[PDB]
Every structure is written in structure tokens, then in C-alpha cells.
From a paper:
In pseudocyclic proteins, such as TIM barrels, β barrels, and some helical transmembrane channels, a single subunit is repeated in a cyclic pattern, giving rise to a central cavity that can serve as a pocket for ligand binding or enzymatic activity. The large set of pseudocycles with central binding pockets described here combines the diversity of native protein scaffolds with the stability and robustness of de novo-designed proteins, and our RIF docking and Rosetta design calculations suggest that the designed pseudocycles provide better starting scaffolds for small-molecule binder design than do either native structures or previously designed de novo NTF2s.
Central pockets in the designs are shown as gray spheres (a–c). The secondary structure interface (d) and the center-water-mediated hydrogen bond network (e) of the refined crystal structure of design H10 are shown using sticks. The electron density map of the interface and the center hydrogen bond network and water are shown as gray mesh. In d and e, the oxygen, nitrogen, and carbon are colored in red, blue, and magenta, respectively; hydrogen bond networks are shown as yellow dashed lines, and water molecules as red spheres. The approach generates a wide variety of structures strongly encoded by their amino acid sequences (as evaluated with RF and AF2, and further indicated by the close agreement between the crystal structures and design models), with between 2 and 7 repeat units (N), repeat lengths of 15 to 78 (L), and all ɑ-, ɑ/β-, and all β-folds.
Residue numbers in the entry: 1 to 127
Amino acid sequence: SKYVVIDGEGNEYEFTDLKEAAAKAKELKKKYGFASISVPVEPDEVAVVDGKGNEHTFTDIKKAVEKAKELAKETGFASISVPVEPDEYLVIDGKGNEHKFTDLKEAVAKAKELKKKYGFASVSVPV
């Protein structure tokens, strides 16, 4: 598999191991303010990755968002991953709304604004 961490500069870090990826994301967030992690998700699923590097899969985005809030507090980190098409980037905010981009730095900039507004936002990238 391939797991991708995105930081606040729009840099992409690739990993073969989820626990190492989730640990990098948690560190970039604590040290530099922002990080998302994208993981392979089955079609019609959504996945939340927590601060322990564990996945939580869902078919209902509203339930995923609810869980992502429990996990960010309990484990120190949470990121929602959704399937994206090549050359697209999707931002999911803390209320479950999806915003589509074709420029990663644009997607990151929006995610930062939505994190301020709603408390939480993730950026999903193609795997």
C-alpha cells in the first residue's frame, strides 16, 4: 500500500507503513501546525486515521466526522481520508462538507481556513 502525509506547505511525504505515516503526520502537526494523512480506502468508504496509527472505516461521512472529533481529542490526532480522482484534492471540514480542488496548495490553504472556522479539516490526495 501507499500512505501519504501532506504538511502545511503542501509537501507530500510517502510511506509504505501506516504507523510510520501516522507518526509523521502527528509530528508535523504538533511541530508546524498542520498535517493530513491519506490512505487507500475501499470505494464507498471513508477512513479516519487516529494518533495511534489505527484506521476507522465508515460508509457514512457524518459518522466519520463524529468519530474524528472523539479521536483527535482522545489520541491527539485525526484525519479523514476519502477516495479522490487523479489530479483532484478534496477538503473535508469539521461539519462533513466536501470542497474540491485541482491545486494542492489551494486545498491546503482552504483546509487551514476551515480548521479555524469549524475546528477540524482534512485534505485528501490521490493514492
